[PDB]
Ligand binder design. Structure first.
Ligand SMILES: Nc1ncnc2c1ncn2[C@@H]1O[C@H](CSCC[C@H](N)C(=O)O)[C@@H](O)[C@H]1O
Length: 251
């Protein structure tokens, strides 16, 4: 239930009143730049959520996006959002699992995964499927949260809590993400630790929900809403809790 409810953002100032929606859009902008895409390419987006990132990509570059998810409501919302921005000709969404993708080999010019791989019960599988469907010359972009070091006591306690409510089936170090990418026979072009920029998202979104307590409360219940706010505030204070951007390429 804390899965499709937290979207990390890119924060730079320490001292500018930008919205949670502002920081999320900036992060997306780093991913757009990190894919390396030009007029006429095709892009696969794995774990599309409700479609915001894919619509932003389409507003920025002239490409075909297809988005993928294992939650039926989300596919319907994403498609409505696409049809609503008039991008139905090129932006489209369907229901499929990244552990077994139903696409032709070498279909896409590019692929991306924004905050989705930590759900997969096995990152390797997913990345292998992703390489299998990119054409040689094709590029990849990953954005996800990581554990920079092993933890204990109350630090481990605050991390576990987060994984429970967000369904984080596999959390790992950067070094682990890298060799997962290398196993799929992709070449790694950049890896950047953006912890310091991503961190503020946690307290800042705890605040947002608070402001909306009486309008979200009936959907989640009081105690559920409280545990989610508490769990973010705990995670914010464990500095072993990190975030990384990774670009990669197919020989
Ligand atoms: N095994 C899997 N295969 C394909 N999609 C999956 C998956 N496991 C989880 N997902 C989907 O991936 C998403 C992860 S949350 C990612 C949010 C999205 N990037 C956004 O900001 O809009 C969820 O929508 C979830 O339904």
């Amino acid at each position: 239930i804390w899965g499709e409810n937290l979207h990390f953002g890119y924060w730079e100032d320490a001292g500018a009143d930008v919205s949670v929606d502002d920081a999320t859009d900036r992060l997306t902008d780093e991913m757009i730049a990190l894919l390396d895409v030009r007029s006429g390419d095709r892009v696969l987006d794995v774990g599309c959520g409700i479609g915001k990132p894919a619509v932003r990509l389409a507003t920025a570059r002239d490409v075909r996006v297809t988005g993928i998810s294992i939650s039926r409501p989300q596919v319907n919302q994403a498609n409505a959002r696409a049809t609503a921005a008039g991008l139905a000709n090129r932006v489209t969404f369907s229901y499929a699992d990244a552990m077994d993708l139903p696409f032709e080999d070498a279909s896409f010019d590019a692929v991306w995964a924004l905050e989705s791989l930590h759900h997969m019960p096995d990152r390797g599988r997913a990345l292998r499927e992703m390489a299998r469907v990119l054409r040689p010359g094709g590029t990849v972009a990953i954005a996800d949260f990581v554990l920079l070091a092993p933890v204990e006591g109350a630090k481990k306690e605050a991390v576990d809590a987060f994984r429970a409510g967000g369904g984080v089936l596999s959390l790992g170090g950067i070094d682990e993400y890298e060799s997962d990418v290398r196993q799929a026979e992709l070449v790694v072009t950049s890896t950047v630790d953006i912890s310091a920029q991503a961190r503020p998202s946690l307290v800042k979104t705890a605040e947002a929900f608070e402001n909306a307590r009486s309008q979200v409360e009936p959907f989640m219940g009081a105690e559920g809403l409280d545990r989610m706010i508490a769990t973010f505030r705990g995670l914010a204070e464990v500095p072993e809790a990190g975030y990384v951007l990774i670009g990669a390429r197919k020989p």
